Structure formats: structure tokens, C-alpha cells
Design goal:
mainly alpha, Proton glutamate symport protein, 17 helices, 81% helix, transport protein, Sodium-coupled aspartate transporter, monomeric, Glutamate transporter homolog
Length: 395
């Protein structure tokens, strides 16, 4: 009987309630100790929530995009596709610079093979692995191809092509339903996921990591205010009215680390925003993973912090390449929870700073201990930027 009441409670309110209690609970153990106990008996629940969010990304990014690409004419897709990718590149070019500026203000493979990897040598192999970006390419290519079949004069081809789209569309609908199911468990997951971090971050609240959080989070505010809002004003969409509609998406996106997990509610927001279907149904699932604004800002500051942690000095040009390559090296894969920590890992690997070195591990471990809330904000801009991009693309 109680379970029925729990589910009937609005999901977003549960999401916030779990967050507040978890942070309060975690900070209590920060002073009472038992940081090991929470990491043992509480964190696994958070890990399960993270695992669930990671699961959603691959089926959604494939099935949703195939439906989205195949649901509109290829000509319109090209117009929208070019517009949306250009939008992210501009904003990411802003986020990458914005993070570098905030990094110093607070002071806490070649290009081609990266591009060639957009074309999977085995589409099934791409799906089997977590290679989100090439899976997007195959999805759109498959989606566009289906439309050409649906217009084919051959009756058998049209019927067979239609059935394939329906099967994939059913998968896309099912995953959205699974997302709603996951969101019901999110309040339990979020509470545990934030309780652990706030337990062993209960100390150092005003340390260097605090400035790292300040550099990022205030960086997010500027990202929203100085990039999204200005862009919305330039295109004639009242940012205040827009963000009012996006309140549900931002909060669900903010607390739930995954942009994909908040995708169905993000689509719901777009519908209420008046954006024509077939534009938000495609850009948003793409945006959940292709968006680079949050990760670039995250790496701009966090990477700078690591450099100082090892007593190194990064000139602006050198730092620009480090963060820019990380962004380029992960044009996708931005929808998984805790992307920054995972994405920062290879940045250290790319440089001669393997995790084997205790100093690198120690400095990185400190970042990992804070990634829980640092990445929480990251999804806020990531799921706000794609909302902006969807709005701007919709004109």
C-alpha cells in the first residue's frame, strides 16, 4: 500500500527530497565519521542508479534518433542537423573558453582518427560497446535510408521498411517508459548517490576543491547567463519565459546526473514550449550526448586544478589544447552520468600522467570525490544548452 503512495507522489518532488536528505545525511557522517560505512552499505544503491542511467544511453540514442531522423524529410534533417551541430560548436567554443577563464580566475591520437571514428567499422560492434558517437552516425544513416524506402514504389519494400521503423519506434517508446521507471527509483538512488559524496566531502568544504566547485558552478551560471540567455535574446525568445518552462527539465537534469534519463521530460518541456515535433524529437536525443558545453567547462577548471596539484604550470595555449582535445575526443558520450570523471581519466592518460602514479591518483581521486556534485551541475548546462539549441533551431 505504501509503495502506491510513493509512486503516486510527483517524481520531481521525490527527486529533490532525496537530494536534500542525502546531502544532510552525508554531511552528518562527515562530522560523525562512518564515511567508510556509507561508502559500503549506501553507495551501492547510488551505483545501481548510475548503472541504470548508463544503460539507457545506448538504446535511446540509437532507437530515438532512428525514429527522429526517419520521421522527417531528409532535406529538413540536413537543415536542422547542420544548425544544431553548429550551435553546439559555438557554445562549446564558449564553454571551453569560459572554463579556462574561470580556471585561472579562481586558481585552485591526432584529430583525423577522432573524426574517422564517427563512422563505425561495425554498427553492431558500436552498439555492443559504449561508442555513442558512431552509433549516432549509423542511427541517422539508417533513419534517412528508411524514409527513402517508405517512399519506394515496391510494395514489399515499403511494408518491410515500415515494419522496421515500427519495431525501432516501439523500442524507443519502451526505453522512454523504462526511463520513467528508472526515475521512480531515482529518489532512492540520488539520496544514496549524494549521501556518500557528502559524507567524505564533509571535510575540506572550504579547501581548494571548494574553489574548484566555485569555478565550475559559477562558470555554469555564466554559461547560462552569458551564452544561452544572450543567444535566446538574439533569436527573440524571452529567456525568462523560456527558463520558466524548462524548470522541470533543468531540475530533473540537474539532480539526475544523466541527460538521457531526463530526456523524456526534456521532450515534454519542448512540447509545452511550442517547438514543432520532429525537431525536438531529433535534436534533443542528439543533444543529450553530442552536447559538449558542460564537459568542456568541467574540464577547463578541473584539468587546471590537476595541473597545479602536481606542481605544473599550463600556459593558456597548452591548456587550450588539453581541454579542446578532450572535448573533440568525446564529441559524444556526454549523456552518461559522471562523464567528467570518466572523460578526465583519458585526458590524464593522453598526457604522460597515468593513474599508476600515486600523486596523479591522489590528485585525481580528490576530483573523483567531488565529481558527484561537480557533474550534477554539468548536466544542468548540458540539458539546458540542448534545450536552448532546440529552441533556437526551432526559430
Amino acid at each position: 500500500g505504501l509503495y502506491r503512495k510513493y509512486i503516486e507522489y510527483p517524481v520531481l518532488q521525490k527527486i529533490l527530497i532525496g537530494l536534500i536528505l542525502g546531502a544532510i545525511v552525508g554531511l552528518i557522517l562527515g562530522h560523525y565519521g562512518y564515511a567508510h560505512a556509507v561508502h559500503t552499505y549506501v553507495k551501492p544503491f547510488g551505483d545501481l542508479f548510475v548503472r541504470l542511467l548508463k544503460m539507457l544511453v545506448m538504446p535511446i540514442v540509437f532507437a530515438s534518433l532512428v525514429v527522429g531522423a526517419a520521421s522527417i524529410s531528409p532535406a529538413r534533417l540536413g537543415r536542422v542537423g547542420v544548425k544544431i551541430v553548429v550551435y553546439y560548436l559555438l557554445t562549446s567554443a564558449f564553454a571551453v573558453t569560459l572554463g579556462i577563464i574561470m580556471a585561472r580566475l579562481f586558481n585552485p591520437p591526432p584529430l583525423v582518427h577522432i573524426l574517422l571514428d564517427i563512422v563505425p567499422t561495425n554498427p553492431f560492434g558500436a552498439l555492443a560497446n559504449g561508442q555513442v558517437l558512431p552509433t549516432i552516425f549509423f542511427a541517422i544513416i539508417l533513419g534517412i535510408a528508411i524514409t527513402y524506402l517508405m517512399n519506394s514504389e515496391n510494395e514489399k519494400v515499403r511494408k518491410s521498411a515500415e515494419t522496421l521503423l515500427d519495431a525501432i519506434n516501439g523500442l524507443a517508446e519502451a526505453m522512454y517508459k523504462i526511463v520513467n521507471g528508472v526515475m521512480q527509483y531515482a529518489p532512492i538512488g540520488v539520496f544514496a548517490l549524494i549521501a556518500y559524496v557528502m559524507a567524505e566531502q564533509g571535510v575540506h568544504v572550504v579547501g581548494e576543491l571548494a574553489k574548484v566547485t566555485a569555478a565550475v558552478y559559477v562558470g555554469l551560471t555564466l554559461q547560462i547567463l552569458l551564452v544561452y540567455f544572450v543567444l535566446l535574446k538574439i533569436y527573440g525568445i524571452d529567456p525568462i519565459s523560456f527558463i520558466k518552462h524548462a524548470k522541470d527539465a533543468m531540475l530533473t537534469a540537474f539532480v539526475t546526473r544523466s541527460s538521457s534519463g531526463t530526456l523524456p521530460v526534456t521532450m515534454r518541456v519542448a512540447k509545452e514550449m511550442g517547438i514543432s515535433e520532429g525537431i525536438y524529437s531529433f535534436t534533443l536525443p542528439l543533444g543529450a550526448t553530442i552536447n559538449m558545453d558542460g564537459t568542456a567547462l568541467y574540464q577547463g577548471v578541473c584539468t587546471f586544478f590537476i595541473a597545479n596539484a602536481l606542481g605544473s604550470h599550463l600556459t593558456v595555449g597548452q591548456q587550450l589544447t588539453i581541454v579542446l582535445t578532450a572535448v573533440l575526443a568525446s564529441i559524444g558520450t556526454a549523456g552518461v552520468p559522471g562523464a567528467g570523471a570518466i572523460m578526465l581519466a583519458m585526458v590524464l592518460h593522453s598526457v604522460g600522467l597515468p593513474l599508476t602514479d600515486p600523486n596523479v591518483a591522489a590528485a585525481y581521486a580528490m576530483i573523483l570525490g567531488i565529481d558527484a556534485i561537480l557533474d550534477m551541475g554539468r548536466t544542468m548546462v548540458n540539458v539546458t544548452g540542448d534545450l536552448t539549441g532546440t529552441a533556437i533551431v526551432a526559430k
